[PDB]
Symmetry: D2
Subunit: 388 residues, 4 copies
């Protein structure tokens, strides 16, 4: 009944989320800029565990070394005063006009080198602040037209960039891992490594694959009409879910970044069920934007809503899995059989097993119902709190 | 000017394409069944190089060993009489009611074993006929609801299945490779390994990854709103493009399987440009369905159209790449720079290079236009044959 | 707490829903055909109010007048024995190969005439059985290619068809109205009158517009990524919501026809809220397909689930609207102001009102938050039954 | 062979198109602001016929009456010096924070009144400059959440707004018509009157429907996965195509506003074919955004490309329709029959016609192929300039 979050829940927010001023492609900002220090304080009061940042969220682009030092000290004091942590950091390689054709895969070589130096500089800061994960979102890596980018060459440049970052981390002896955040499009017509699958495949071609994982975002996969929980399951199966971005999205359209729980509610339920049952111990990070219709009270209400929805869904998913009637239904649908090896007896045994082919009664097997609808209605009843 | 195909062009068609009777979710068949022998003859006359098949296209499900032998002999004679090849074969693990919850990942263990035996049986036949690639399309592997399938367990079963097939091939000393064909949905609500990326990632977790590649289909990736040429480039980059399915699709909706060239025409141009420039030497396979509005003359016109469109696009892509004005435009857009290493000088050299950060003039770099629009209009002019 | 349906709830089902055999584009039927009489009985036991039918669901295509009479008598007796009603009927102008290019807009004139006669014949039967609404779903009206159909001519033929049906109804003195059911695509590449909006616009060009309305289906509008509740609101605003098809759909892809409640759950909540608050008194019709993974027990579980979900959502929507805290939030968000005329004072008064422009403080107005996030979280809490 | 535009072609551009600075949701501007006077001159040199504007593009928001007068005089002189016309004008009711919840349908009544006064003020200016059409794009009319907007009330407010504008125009004796521009989403989660169909339906409920039409945009309808040429055909059929916005879009995602010709090339061909054959005499207006990767030379290249592509497509569509082999194919596909009335003989004659039902040979009719594939390949050959 009580859905109050505590820092033990590991809820985190990016500074750019509650700090989003409301500027969109067709309108000016509707809210004044927030001082990172005020955000840290406000979030701590709501029950958050920590915050994340892009280098440029914390230190205005173009800042001198002294100003940079000042901005960091103020922030550090706010963390000390609240007990807030900084589990992840990332680089802004998308806002400045110089990154109009990308950062790591920009056609101009000088821009690619600059991108790497800007990233490395923030990796040092991230480590200093205690971050365990460093996220990379290649928002500008891609194209609007076919001849503008040779994708094979671009992937060589992307691999070269990540390999160099791995070499840097290893040489400095840092205890930090990278997580690639996929997105299919926006702001580029098509973005490279568009989904969790493409990102996972790419990671296997890096020199030190063990240092890289993925940071999937619910809305991003939904922008390609994909099943988010399924994508997360594949990431977990590969042992690559290093971090996760939680939010809401209503189908295939622009990236809405609604508060978590909004958008596809049932997908949110299945996501929470999976994370909790798989024992994901990383942060529950919200990358969302409080709609521009809201004033400051609305941004804090929206932020609180992210955490509340996760906690309600967690309760309902747990009740679902603990319900004896559901456990019975899972057996009726043969989920237990799905977990048993198809042929632990081996290939030869399988080939010699007449019950597997020559004497297999296909019609009898075909007539068995899967009982998935009853199981799904039990899930619906639990989600809606209408069990009886 | 002449766009006549010859077997040298490597165009192939599945028996199920020109043989599609026109039955859809809301209507009965509009065409009579075609005898595979007649299809082979008709295709040979059109200039095709070969045909492909699912076990059930060639041998009616439930056929006795004698009938099976008869069906194969007739087919073999047609191949001998025409000079047609069979470069690829696949298994039908989706039509029969027994596969309603899948083949390799069905919840019922007995069905999974049956699926493997049915596949192995057709692998032997494929080798006998000279096929070099064996395709697997897990059309029924997936779900309509969240609790019906634990994806981690399903992926274990999928890996187990492919590992066993690899062991079989290796033990028999066959010279055949596997290609996984992804599809995001339809006929299941969500299909496992939904895109080329997910398939590539999965392959890296198999015991013998070198035996597996992908068989992407233009319409399938477009069903998720993805850029097909980009996906193919990633597959080539990984050295995994073993085969390809060519067709047309108009956006995000049901799988239309229109003739190649129809649907997204510009994507078709960029695809051909990529395949030809990368030196893809595999078959140019068409997996399409002549619309049910057509009679038999219409199916052959549609089939001929697939090949004609590929040949026209090939001519235009070649003219584009050979045009000195385009080569100049590519340099203006720095495609040459994209192909040069970002830091062949090494990490330390990069960190010490003041021109890469401390003295980098971001504003000057930012002011350079990419000239992508002029380049894209040159591509448009070439596609439309309006160069001057 | 009790969500048991009674015939008073007006829940109806098409014979083709629970009777769907499971045949899809890639597979054969998984269930045996149901006798309409058994369906009527089974539905009555579940608490349904009535059933609907296509002519061909009730009388096999090609039936002689005697067989036709027999099929109708049996059905009629089942209705009498159960108390079930038949509030709506429709024509199957999509299954038979003759309708491959359409019914009312087929290019062949003889087919268009046949389509009209087949429809008229079933209108007589519908009236005999007591149907008040006659639905028309032009599933085959459309095209896969641009030159195949001149849309202006096709719309002339569509208007001609509906005008003739109106003349027939009027001349016979029948008390029955028509409802056009839109769908954007599938089985045709693009279907004419693709959304509720296009259908409403078309109706205004008919000779007797008062006889025609719309029969929107949740999944159909969602196939175009549209907001279903918004579409229904426009239909109600125009006084054209004559009937409605309830089901579930997971985004933009093939038409899934999942049970109501599945798919976009929040959209389902807002739909129910709107129907109940607007006083829609027509039938709550379910046009869904129990997944082919199910046996007969599963189809009845799925059917029961449709009604259960509607009843749960009705309870939650009512609690939401009755909550004093929500009523306060609605005022905070100025929903009360939205309902007040912008300028009941008139045009001249508006032009002379300096507070509306010359002395309007745009900055003060701009600074007011809309408080939509708090309102939406109150809606979420009510839906999930987590109010406190 | 020559594709040079002349003012006779009626090509127009909005000031906000070539003047777009490149600011998107994730990045700052990449180009400096253009002075409207320079845009008029540059466009005139390219062969454009005229320009269009939003009030705020021409007169900075908040300008005093004197500055306003100055800005208008400069603009007027540029028009006089070049011969450029201003056929359409519109209001910016989306950029300023005050319109965060809409203009005509904002929940706050004072904002709705302000919106009307701002619009009326620009209508006077539009008439002064000679504009014949006044466009309204309700970009902010809509919502991100269900309870934020009661759609029935919002439509009452929308009708009230348009009715008042009609009364104003009529009372002043202006010769100007309105055109509503639909868009399904972005910047709002869902926008009211999302498609051409919804807009057409709404127009029929206004007090003076004859004063209102639609201004469809290719990319907007494609954002809902709809067939643009089909939508335009419905608009023409109703006599409501008052203006049109030409651009390119690659499927269902954010609004790209690519140059015309880019995106769905075949849809562009069918659109041009329809406009030219139907005798649309209104302006060919381009509402596009030169990608932010471009410098100023790139924006002019992109603008020129819009016109070039329209002219090439016009040539190809005309050659297609004039080709005797195509005319023969159109008859083979019975397009001539589609244009003939289904039953000019009348209802009674139809009911008594035994050839229409009792003696209709459905099987013979069903066996006729439509020959749509050959027709479509002839269209493809013409588009690609590969006829022989
Ligand atoms: O869409 C944008 C991305 O998700 C971004 O906000 C962050 O996650 C990392 O930059
Ligand atoms: O959509 C279906 C698939 O593409 C299939 O037809 C073949 O490629 C392999 O079974
Ligand atoms: O998708 C199909 C349609 O919705 C159909 O089943 C019925 O509503 C009317 O024929
Ligand atoms: O997407 C935005 C709209 O199309 C807009 O730019 C103009 O047409 C009218 O404001
Ligand atoms: Ni994001
Ligand atoms: Ni996002
Ligand atoms: Ni993110
Ligand atoms: Ni396919
Ligand atoms: Ni396909
Ligand atoms: Ni295929
Ligand atoms: Ni339907
Ligand atoms: Ni449907
Ligand atoms: Ni329906
Ligand atoms: Ni637009
Ligand atoms: Ni647009
Ligand atoms: Ni526009």
């Amino acid at each position: 009944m009580n859905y109050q979050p505590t820092p033990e829940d590991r809820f985190t927010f990016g500074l750019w989320t509650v700090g989003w001023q409301g500027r969109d492609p067709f309108g000016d900002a509707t809210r004044r800029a927030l001082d990172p220090v005020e955000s840290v304080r406000r979030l701590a009061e709501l029950g958050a565990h920590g915050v994340t940042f892009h280098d440029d969220d914390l230190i205005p682009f173009g800042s001198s070394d002294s100003e940079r030092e000042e901005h960091v000290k103020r922030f550090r004091q706010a963390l000390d005063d609240t007990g807030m942590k900084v589990p992840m950091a990332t680089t802004n390689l998308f806002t400045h006009p110089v990154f109009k054709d990308g950062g790591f895969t920009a056609n101009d070589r000088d821009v690619r080198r600059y991108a790497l130096r800007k990233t490395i500089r923030n990796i040092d800061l991230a480590v200093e602040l205690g971050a365990e994960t460093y996220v990379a979102w290649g928002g500008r890596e891609g194209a609007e037209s076919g001849g503008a980018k040779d994708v094979r060459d671009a992937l060589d440049r992307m691999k070269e960039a990540f390999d160099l970052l791995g070499e840097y981390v290893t040489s400095q002896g840092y205890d930090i891992r990278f997580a690639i955040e996929p997105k299919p499009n926006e702001p580029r017509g098509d973005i490279l490594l568009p989904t969790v699958g493409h990102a996972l495949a790419f990671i296997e071609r890096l020199e030190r694959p063990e240092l890289y994982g993925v940071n999937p975002e619910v809305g991003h996969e939904q922008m390609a009409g994909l099943n988010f929980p399924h994508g997360i399951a594949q990431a977990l199966w590969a042992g690559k879910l290093f971090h996760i971005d939680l939010n809401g999205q209503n189908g295939i359209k622009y990236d809405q970044d609604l508060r978590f729980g909004a958008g596809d509610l049932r997908a949110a339920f299945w996501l929470v069920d999976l994370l909790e049952s798989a024992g994901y111990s990383g942060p529950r990070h919200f990358d969302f934007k409080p709609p521009r219709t809201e004033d400051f009270d609305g941004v804090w209400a929206s932020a609180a809503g992210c955490m509340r929805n996760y906690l309600i869904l967690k309760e309902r998913a747990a009740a679902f899995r603990a319900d004896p009637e559901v456990q019975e239904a899972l057996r009726a649908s043969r989920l237990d059989e799905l977990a048993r090896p198809t042929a632990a007896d081996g290939l030869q045994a399988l080939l010699d097993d007449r019950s597997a082919f020559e004497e297999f009664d296909v019609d009898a097997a075909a007539a068995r119902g899967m009982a998935f609808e009853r199981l799904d209605q039990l899930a619906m009843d639990h989600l809606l709190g209408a069990r009886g």
